[PDB]
Amino acid sequence: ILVIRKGWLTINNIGIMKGGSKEYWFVLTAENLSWYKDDEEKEKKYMLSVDNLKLRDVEKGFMSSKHIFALFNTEQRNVYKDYRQLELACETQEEVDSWKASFLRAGVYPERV
Amino acid sequence: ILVIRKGWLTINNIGIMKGGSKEYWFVLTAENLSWYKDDEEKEKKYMLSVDNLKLRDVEKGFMSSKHIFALFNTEQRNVYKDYRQLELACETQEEVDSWKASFLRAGVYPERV
Amino acid sequence: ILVIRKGWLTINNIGIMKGGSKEYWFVLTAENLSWYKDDEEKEKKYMLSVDNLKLRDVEKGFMSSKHIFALFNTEQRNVYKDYRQLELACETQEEVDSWKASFLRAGVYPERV
Amino acid sequence: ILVIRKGWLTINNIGIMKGGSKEYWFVLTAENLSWYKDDEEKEKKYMLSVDNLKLRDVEKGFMSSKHIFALFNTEQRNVYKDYRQLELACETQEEVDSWKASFLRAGVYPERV
Amino acid sequence: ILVIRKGWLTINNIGIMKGGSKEYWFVLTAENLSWYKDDEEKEKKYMLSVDNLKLRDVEKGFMSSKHIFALFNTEQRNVYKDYRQLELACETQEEVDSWKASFLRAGVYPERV
Amino acid sequence: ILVIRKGWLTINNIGIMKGGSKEYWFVLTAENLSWYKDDEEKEKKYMLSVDNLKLRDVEKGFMSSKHIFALFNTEQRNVYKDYRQLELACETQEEVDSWKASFLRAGVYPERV
Amino acid sequence: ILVIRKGWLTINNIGIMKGGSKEYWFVLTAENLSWYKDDEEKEKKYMLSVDNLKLRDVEKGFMSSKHIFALFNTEQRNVYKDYRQLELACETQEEVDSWKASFLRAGVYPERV
Amino acid sequence: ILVIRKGWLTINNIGIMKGGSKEYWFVLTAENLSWYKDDEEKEKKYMLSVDNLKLRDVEKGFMSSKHIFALFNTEQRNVYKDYRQLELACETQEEVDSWKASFLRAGVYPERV
Amino acid sequence: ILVIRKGWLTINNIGIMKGGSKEYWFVLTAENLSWYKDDEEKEKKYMLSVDNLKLRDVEKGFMSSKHIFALFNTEQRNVYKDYRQLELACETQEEVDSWKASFLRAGVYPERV
Amino acid sequence: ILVIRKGWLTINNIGIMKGGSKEYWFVLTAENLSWYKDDEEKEKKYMLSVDNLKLRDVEKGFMSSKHIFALFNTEQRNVYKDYRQLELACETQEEVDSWKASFLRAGVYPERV
Amino acid sequence: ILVIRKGWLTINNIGIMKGGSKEYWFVLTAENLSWYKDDEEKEKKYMLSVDNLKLRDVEKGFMSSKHIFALFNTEQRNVYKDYRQLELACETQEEVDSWKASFLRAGVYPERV
Amino acid sequence: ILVIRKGWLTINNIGIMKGGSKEYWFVLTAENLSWYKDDEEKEKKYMLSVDNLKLRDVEKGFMSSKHIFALFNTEQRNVYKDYRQLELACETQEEVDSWKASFLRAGVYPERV
Amino acid sequence: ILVIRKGWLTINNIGIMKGGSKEYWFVLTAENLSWYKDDEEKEKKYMLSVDNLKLRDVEKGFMSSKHIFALFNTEQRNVYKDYRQLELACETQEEVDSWKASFLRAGVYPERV
Amino acid sequence: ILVIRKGWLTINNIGIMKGGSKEYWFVLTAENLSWYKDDEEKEKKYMLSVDNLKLRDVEKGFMSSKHIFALFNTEQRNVYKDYRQLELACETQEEVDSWKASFLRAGVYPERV
Amino acid sequence: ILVIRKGWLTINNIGIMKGGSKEYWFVLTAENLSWYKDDEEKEKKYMLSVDNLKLRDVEKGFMSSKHIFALFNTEQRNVYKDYRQLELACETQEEVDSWKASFLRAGVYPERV
Amino acid sequence: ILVIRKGWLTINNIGIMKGGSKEYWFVLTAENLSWYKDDEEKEKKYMLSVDNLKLRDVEKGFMSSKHIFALFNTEQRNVYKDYRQLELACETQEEVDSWKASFLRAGVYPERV
């Protein structure tokens, strides 16, 4: 497999008193987006397929620094587990645009309609 | 007693510098909703009666992941202690709908009017 | 690790030589689905890995009031023992619907009916 | 001095990376409102005079549980140090009304105009 | 554990053989209601468990300016000693009303008058 | 170099699961704004030039205590690294006005247009 | 403990027998106001407690461009040594105004002119 | 310390005597830009400090489909070895654009073309 | 909570109608003694509370090489189901002796033979 | 803060008009010595500060089997109320001796007999 | 039951990476020695009978401050669980002698032979 | 593989400012002794072969509670890595004897000579 | 009072699960030795008189770095509270000799006999 | 993770077509052995996994003063590239001996010569 | 400078309530032994000259795992600051011998006499 | 950071034009030696870096009872101002000797007399 990008991304919507909102190490390929506990890639948390994934800018509206985008399955109501979208937060819009650009190489395109 | 459901739920409106917003282990029966410190059910925090309880979706409006619903007493201004409603937060709307469905089995129905 | 839900379910496809469809106490986590004789959890009949499990709606089933669904391993014939699929029943449809939302959370998705 | 009330109250607007938003033990008399680190009243943080103090409900608007009121000096732009108002947070509106009522006994009345 | 409130209250129903109605210093927590001779807390007259206590409005009472309310154990004759109910008085109605909100917080609810 | 001002300021938009929103010790001169880990000025985090910097009040709108202003480069889309503006938070508006005034001495003027 | 501000100020009322008005390096905290010969802080001329200090606008002063203000102990004749009040000057009015906001923060309020 | 990004890039200006332009695996942090023979990171060809580096658009370059950009030390002739500038290429423009946003984050800004 | 020991033991007194004496996988904690069909722990035959259990040496037993000991509830007839005592066997005496030391640790003491 | 000891002691010098010498439940800390009617601690007769207290052996006392010792304030006439010294008795000498070691720990030293 | 003594004591020989060497709240009566997590006596850790208990000074030899004594069963090799003796540590020899004296009242006498 | 024993054991001689002296979950078979981070056996720290292993009681001499034994290779100076022996600590001698007994079943015998 | 010395010293024999072995800020004068929580001397822990104090080297024998000396009262068995000696630990013998020398100036001389 | 040692070693068996035996900068951890051109670590020639590596004394070697040893994979022909074994040399025997102790620590044991 | 060795070593005799016994990153050359906070060598704690240094095995006698050696100045009573020797602890004797060997290359020889 | 010692010392070589030898209050840390007019620390005469300082015994000095020593910068003419060396005096030799041990601790070593 060819790696399109590896980097840190905060998972914004899968956090509470269980697993608090954390930052994971993501590895994007043309076929999957996996995340690990750290860049040593010793503990893998999940491997999501890029099939039917689109990208959308989340409700960044709340006056906070975090810049959010979200991946979703156009052929399903839930992207993974019982989540509608996988929200991914970054520190800047530049970083978000940067990642958006990498996703195009994986076949993950901006919201269809 | 027959248990309708046991699971974790975050108490959203009973938290501050005293007891911080925590997640408790809830046990729902046809007659009560009790919560414990953990699933070992060794330390019981409270036992609330299902009498006159209705269910309502809380001000989820704040751009956050938490999905909230709330239980209330239709024959009283306060559900327990000095709280108007008992706010219960979940990670997804699916989880909230899931719990809403269990409550119907306890006689706790969506907001009357 | 975290328990997703505990609740009673009827196993609809237990052999004649074991009473037939009986109600058992289920415990679901992100890794396994275990069932006990009761909520005291002194006797665990089985613990099935959440791995490769998918979920399907069982064509009505017996001539009863039960609403059925079933678990099946996407990669093999039997799901556990010599069973093909584990048939679960609920006296109500919304009960089946709340459990379907919980399985999603453990990663057990529908389809492949 | 006669004590009108002693209890815990969260100081909402005097917190950051210095002193984080904390809960202090307040002692209200007819002439002052002092706060300590704890109910042992060993470490006194401040003693504010009730002279020219009025009371007002703070921007509780943010979808959170905290219920806030605030004290201010009608003959000055700053109540203490460089703060416009002293924001005091509680867990319920009942608790806030409860404290509002105690303040009337100290000569601290609801916002004049 | 956490102290809900400390403040003076008049015990309206103390026997002739103890001065009659005297003012005592109360300390309320989620577990007990204790009263001292004064705010130095050197002499505690009593500590009553918050268990099974409910609250009722006392039919005006004596021919005075006092506003009365009383505590009574829902499950027994006497509330403490040989008392039936503990009569508490305040020179103002709002004073009684602020204390009623504090008792709710300890779980002492009204009715059963 | 002549120091115009030294003091603590919270960096509001450069924080996440990496470096959490922190408070640093800032040293402003007529030519630069540097920040250190602490007032001992042993660990320097950065040195920003005052060239082409303007000042603007950030989206303080979110009902919180923090009062924010932000510095930006009028001849560039990014002030430093990949940040549009450097958000600096204070406890009061007085503190913000206080710092605004110091910036004028450095040639950092309120938003041009 | 926390340093509120460090910056140069001119002491306007230093005796003829000490050069006259000289600029010194000030360090303000919530407890003291100290002044050094320079920003290296090798020689501290004095450390004045923030206790009982108040602030007044000095009637223009000398026939210069300096904007003056002064510190005085509300409870005594001299503020330090044999001084009555400590006269501080700034070449600009806004400079005096930023420092006035910092003193407020240490609790040094105006009036008593 | 924190890894900003890992991804393949083509070094466009490698000498004839080393295969010519080859693709290498880059790792960027706030301090260095390192390149390996591949993503297993067993052989690091070089580690270049982010210090004094700036970024320029390379005048199209060869007669190919590659989009080029280059790194150069603002304070010296060679960027590494005897190179002047390190030419990096991407088959797409948006690929170059995502990497430019990542370099900004490490402090490598454009211009000086 | 803490697991004291996991190891195989033969239950010597299982009824003819269940194969007879079979080896099961035991898990001992300070609260319970559970036995599974094997070390994968998919099927728990039983979980017996450590409460009131004592330990006795079983008068040799069958005409075999097994060394037997048994658990019995000091306060009742049956130890579990309709059993009186749970007979455990080991092919060696030291094996029985190591297990006796582990039970002591869970509080199961000898005597009452 | 830390409780040094809790145990019954007989107050030997209680006035005729209070039953005479009665046994009370004592609680000693490094700051106070409190006595209750019993170990439930519902009624505290008194709380005496450990300040300036010293300890003396009481000249045998009454014609009984009690071993007496007493507490007295080194700086005043009465130790509490109108008492001079608080006489404490134990049926055994070693009982008095264990309590003397506990008082030392709270700083109440012997002598001044 | 009559309480001989309540106080804090460190359990010296039941600690490791499981439960670290802790200090518990002990309650000694003529028939048992129980210990709790704290002086609120809400969580009881154990209740040991005083039957056949003797007392002995442990290997205090190690140059440390802790002063140790130990209780043991003369009619058994183990006092509780799999422990030979229950080691109890104190801060001073005085404290140890103090507790030794209390034990005599419980029938726990110094080592027999 | 047949498991002889699973349980917790403290590794006494492989700890310092790197990995502090920890407790691991050990699994002993007839051919190996492996240890994991916990009883979930998800993270395996090491797998040691039982070949040429003998057992010896370590320098328990230091007046501490820990009871130590150690495994060693008779055909080598080092048992694993650069360690002479693998020291394993327990809470009691009973626990140590208990484990010694299990080791005999693995072919690990008491020190040869 | 004239201060002979101020510095940090570890109290070696007054520590356990209550107050752990801590380091305090000591102030020695010709008449007392006081210690505070820190060098700000805001929280005073104790003030010991130098009357009848001698100095002795404690059981430094235990192979540790700490160098210990101890103060004692020659006219008493206990120096303060229920402690025989006040053990003070230092990092080097030089530091201990250094402090010994300062004590001579306070009238605290090496062990008499 | 933890670095075991960093130091120069001569690779004795580098091909003629690479200068021959050259000295390289080694970094050993419990997982890999990496070598750089120098101690600045800008160019890593290789990173070899500690897996399956063993160590042997190389039969003197060349007619020089070098003391040689070599690393070889117990489970394969080549250790890295087309090498069979990695020959390492030191000008002194004790130098080889210190490195052998470090490899043991990473688990590289001798023999299989 | 040529580096003889870099690695971690615990400083055993410079630790207390100030800087606790820590592990530092040491860099040994033919002329100095420096230590840093970590292997990034960003924060240097000290640089000691190898002049007149000898090596000696410290009082390892205390039954602990740590293996200690110590460096000292033969022409002085103190090696650095007020320390007689610089104690360096390791996990094994092998590690200590390993480091001893490296020191010989620096001119640091075993204790002279 | 940590204060090594605070104590009075006489500066023996202060010029005639400043009273001559006066006693000042010294504060020594591992970085600086500061002296104040007194122990209130309101006026710091100077703060000298511990850098390059060494210590020498001053050839008796004046015809007095003072024991002198002096600080001098090994790398320059003056130690502070136009002084060459800072002469410090003590009325006793042991006083000088205790201070010499403290300076060592800050790294100020003797010799170069």
From Swiss-Prot, chains A, B, C, D, E, F, G, H, I, J, K, L, M, N, O, P:
Top-level taxon of origin: Eukaryota
Residues covered by the PH domain: 2-108
What compartments host this protein? Cell membrane; Membrane, Clathrin-coated pit; Cytoplasmic vesicle; Presynapse
List where this protein forms a coiled coil: none
Q: How is it modified after translation?
A: Phosphorylated by CDK5 leading to synaptic vesicle endocytosis (SVE) activation.
The free-text function statement in the UniProt record for this protein reads: Catalyzes the hydrolysis of GTP and utilizes this energy to mediate vesicle scission and participates in many forms of endocytosis, such as clathrin-mediated endocytosis or synaptic vesicle endocytosis as well as rapid endocytosis (RE). Associates to the membrane, through lipid binding, and self-assembles into rings and stacks of interconnected rings through oligomerization to form a helical polymer around the vesicle membrane leading to constriction of invaginated coated pits around their necks.
Spell out the family assignment given in the record's similarity comment.
Belongs to the TRAFAC class dynamin-like GTPase superfamily. Dynamin/Fzo/YdjA family.
Illness the protein is tied to: Developmental and epileptic encephalopathy 31A: An autosomal dominant epileptic encephalopathy, a heterogeneous group of severe early-onset epilepsies characterized by refractory seizures, neurodevelopmental impairment, and poor prognosis. Development is normal prior to seizure onset, after which cognitive and motor delays become apparent.
Q: How does it assemble?
A: Homodimer; homodimerization is mediated by the dynamin-type G domain which promotes assembly-stimulated GTPase activity. Homo-tetramer formed from two dimers in the absence of lipid. Oligomerizes into a helical polymer that self-assembles around the vesicle membrane, when associated to the menbrane through lipid binding.
Record text about domains: The dynamin-type G mediates homodimerization and plays a role in self-assembly. The C-terminal proline-rich domain (PRD) mediates interaction with SH3-binding partners. Is required for DNM1 self-assembly.
Identification of the protein by name: Dynamin-1
Organism annotation: Homo sapiens (Human)
Q: What is the lineage of its organism?
A: Eukaryota, Metazoa, Chordata, Craniata, Vertebrata
